[PDB]
From a paper:
We isolated and characterized two Shigella podophages that have notably different features when compared with classical podophages and instead are most closely related to phage N4. We describe the isolation and characterization of phages [name] and B2, including whole-genome sequencing and analysis, cryo–electron microscopy (cryo-EM) structure determination, mass spectrometry, host range studies, and enzymatic assays of the tail proteins. Our work shows that these phages have divergent decoration proteins and unique tail structures, and encode and package their own phage-dependent RNA polymerase, and the tails, which display esterase activity, are dependent on specific O-antigen modifications of lipopolysaccharide (LPS) for entry. [name] and B2 are similar to bacteriophage N4—these are all T = 9 podophages, which encapsidate their own polymerases—a hallmark of this phage family.
We also analyzed the data by imposing icosahedral symmetry to visualize the capsids at high resolution (3.6 and 3.4 Å for [name] and B2, respectively). Both capsids have a T = 9 geometry. The [name] of each has the HK97-like fold that is present in most, if not all, dsDNA tailed phages. Using DALI, both the major capsid proteins of [name] and B2 are most similar to Ralstonia phage GP4 (37), another T = 9 podophage with an RMSD (root mean square deviation) of 3.0 and 3.2 Å, respectively. The decoration proteins of both [name] and B2 bind the capsid proteins at the same quasi-sixfold symmetry axes in both phages but have notably different folds. [name]’s decoration protein (gp28) displays an immunoglobulin (Ig) domain–like structure that is similar to Hoc in phage T4 (39). The cryo-EM density map of [name] was sufficient to clearly model the first 183 amino acids of 273 total residues in gp28. The C-terminal portion is likely also an Ig-like domain that forms the trimer spike similar to Hoc, but the resolution of this region was too poor to accurately model. Whereas the capsids of [name], B2, and GP4 are highly similar, it seems that the capsid decoration proteins may stabilize weak points in the capsids in different ways.
Numbering used by the authors:
A (entry chain K): 3 to 182
B (entry chain H): 1 to 51
C (entry chain G): 52 to 401
D (entry chain H): 152 to 301
E (entry chain H): 352 to 401
The structure:
Amino acid sequence: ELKVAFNKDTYVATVLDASGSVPSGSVNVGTFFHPDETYPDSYVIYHGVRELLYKRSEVDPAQPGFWPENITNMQAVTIDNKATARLVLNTSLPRVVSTIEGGKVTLSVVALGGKAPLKYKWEFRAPNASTWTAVSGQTTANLVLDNIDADKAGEYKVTVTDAAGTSVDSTALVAVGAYP
Amino acid sequence: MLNYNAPIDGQKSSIDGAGSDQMNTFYWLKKAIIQARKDQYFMPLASVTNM
Amino acid sequence: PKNMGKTIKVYEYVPLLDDRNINDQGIDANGAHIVNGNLYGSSKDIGTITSKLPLLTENGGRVNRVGFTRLSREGSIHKFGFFYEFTQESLDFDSDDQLKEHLSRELMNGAVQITEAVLQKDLLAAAGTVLYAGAATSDATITGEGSTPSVITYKNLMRLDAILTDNRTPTQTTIITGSRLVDTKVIGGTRVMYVGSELVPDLKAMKDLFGNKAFIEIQHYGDAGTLMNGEIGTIDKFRIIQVPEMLHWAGAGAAATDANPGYRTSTVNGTEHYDVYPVLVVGDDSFTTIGFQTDGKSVKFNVMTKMPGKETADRNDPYGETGFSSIKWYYGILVKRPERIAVMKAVAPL
Amino acid sequence: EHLSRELMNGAVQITEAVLQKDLLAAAGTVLYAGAATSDATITGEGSTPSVITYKNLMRLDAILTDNRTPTQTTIITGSRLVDTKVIGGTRVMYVGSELVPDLKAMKDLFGNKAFIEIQHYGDAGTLMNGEIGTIDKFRIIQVPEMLHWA
Amino acid sequence: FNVMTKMPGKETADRNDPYGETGFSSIKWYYGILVKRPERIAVMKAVAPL
């Protein structure tokens, strides 16, 4: 959730983080979830700010208002995002990773954004299973499966959680070729 | 034995290896089930005094 | 078509004002984000309609938003097949000389009957309106001996007609106004029922609502209207067709005791249980039988006879004295609109 | 195309819904079946449930004759066929699907059936759409979507 | 019924959206009733079975 604050005087709509600080004059215009729960990769900071201001009277942002008299000319509204960057996954686990009994496989994930402390966690689902047995001792954003055997085949998933809590995940199906 | 020409229920066929599934697993019939406009019984028995 | 899977899926476009049109997109008459987006849905309550009207002011802005949905529906194919074997001496040292033909015919007839039975089972399974005659809440509570038994009555058929009309299920026939021939009557049936051959004794004695005969036989209206084959009479709004081969659950009723007044009872694990008989009415355009490779016909059989001789020898039979003949087919239905099919489960007299 | 279709059908249905509601709310001769005198006292349990009875429809028309409500349909005097009947239906009455079963099994003043259905009078009567029959002097029309108070 | 629909493209392109990728369709109308004689409308209330 990202708290937005509007300063009619400068027509500035600073998008602070949940725990931000309404700048001098900037009246709390409301909050909204940047990664829209329903449609995450379909909306951007603007959409939220726009709607939050559509329901605020022109005469006084602080006072709510509707279509007849509200802040809708986004041309003037100056949006200044003072909120944490959206946790993204520039590099994600290699969709599929085929190897033979022995061949080392390395799953890699590069996360950018979120709160600085980007913690990592690896979970493993055996073939034909539902439980995601978390790989113990793996917080490295890089799992080297050296001398892999047939048992270590299956799906491997990461969970890049930021200090805040937002977590980006990626999975990779490791296939190990066995030999009599 | 290469078999199972249709794994709709997550039951991957023989020929398909890791990270692969049948491109088409069903047929898509064009004709869509559609409910008609509801029967009207009170608008007909009206009159218009134009304003 | 081939190389296209073993299931067929369609789309059902739910109308706007339906109680199944759930969507996040929704705005009230004041710009608020109301949860539902189907206005008032399929609600015939005055309060709901009045409260959720799409009132829009003269300086109309961004009020009154409504969304839409689409629902898929699936259906698959299942295979069948059976065969029989015959030694050469059986067809060569037999009193009859046409045994092969008299077995091929008696096998094909059986295959056709099997196809009919499986179609009947699928229709009796996929029923949107599964209605229980009498005072039964489940199949296990369909009895015939309690204070209130489970027998087909006039009120139950009236309720089935009401439910079918409400689901917007279309009529199949038209009412028959009278003739000039004396002792004839006027049937008023538009639906077509498909009772078994065991409910007819009970269905031929329902005392209306006022203790009058409520079974106008076919002879009373043959002059003034068409007669559908298999007909035995009409009841309220159901032109009745007797189906000789009518599937019936046996033992899916209640416990049977000595107070049994004479209703059919089968046996399931010792203690006898009552038998449940269906009254199936299937509406127009409710299902389709997806024929795979069956050109036009719903089911195409494949004969695979192999005469004993030089065409059946192998290491398993160096002498080659046995043959076989097999029939196999594909079958499956897609119930596009499972709201026309309706069933009354009830007991039948012994 | 389907989106626009659904939009238009929703608009038409909602418009008729408004008409239904307003006509119901603008009723001048309001009567209550059974021993009732208000909505809050309408009931279905006790000695006198609010069930439509032959007397209640008879009282309904008596008011509709004092209030000079003009008759709409004529009377079917009979046909030449065998099992047809005569009809005294003058006014047109609309019923929801819910109340139809209670009208089907409702007795006349002598303890018999008075719901002569559409199949009886078809040769003479120019049966209107949605008709299900006449009871005493009202020709009933079923309204597939008829509103109600919950 | 009055319908005004604007497809995505040049029509919806403005300065609050200089790409034109958001359409809309709206239907509006007027309605009312003049009840001249209310005594000719006779509603009756009851309870119907389940």
